[PDB]
Every structure is written in C-alpha cells, then in structure tokens.
From Swiss-Prot:
Transmembrane segments: 9-28, 41-59
Extracellular topology ranges: 1-8
Full protein stretch here: 15 to 83 of 262
Similarity field: Belongs to the archaeal/bacterial/fungal opsin family.
Cytoplasmic side: 29-40
Name of the protein: Bacteriorhodopsin
Organism: Halobacterium salinarum (strain ATCC 700922 / JCM 11081 / NRC-1)
Length: 67
C-alpha cells in the first residue's frame, strides 16, 4: 500500500502510547500497590520493550517522531 491506504504511522504512535502506558502500569503492579525475578522483570518490561521497539520503528521512519 504505497498509496498509504491508512496512517500506520499514527496507528503505530497509538500502539506505542498504549504499550508505554501498559509498561508503566505493569511496573506499578510489580512495585506493589510466578517463576523467577528475571522472568517477572521481563514480564513487567513487556510493554517497555514493546514501546521501545515501536519508538525505534517510528523513529526509523521519522514520521511521528519527525513531523
């Protein structure tokens, strides 16, 4: 879809925002108010990694990050 059928950049931005808030929320849960500490950390950094990847992606193209 070189004709840009949809703003995947915006969709990515939204997805990154969601993932970000998700990571923060997960960290809050981890803070306090199943297998290993490492596993739990990764599980709590699931949204953190997702956000990082999405941020790197949007940055790669330079659409939302570089309007």
């Amino acid at each position: 879809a070189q004709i840009t059928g949809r703003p995947e950049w915006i969709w990515l931005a939204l997805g990154t925002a969601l993932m970000g808030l998700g990571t923060l929320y997960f960290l809050v849960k981890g803070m306090g108010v199943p297998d290993a500490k490492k596993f739990y950390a990764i599980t709590t950094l699931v949204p953190a990694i997702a956000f990082t990847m999405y941020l790197s992606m949007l940055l790669g193209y330079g659409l939302t990050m570089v309007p």
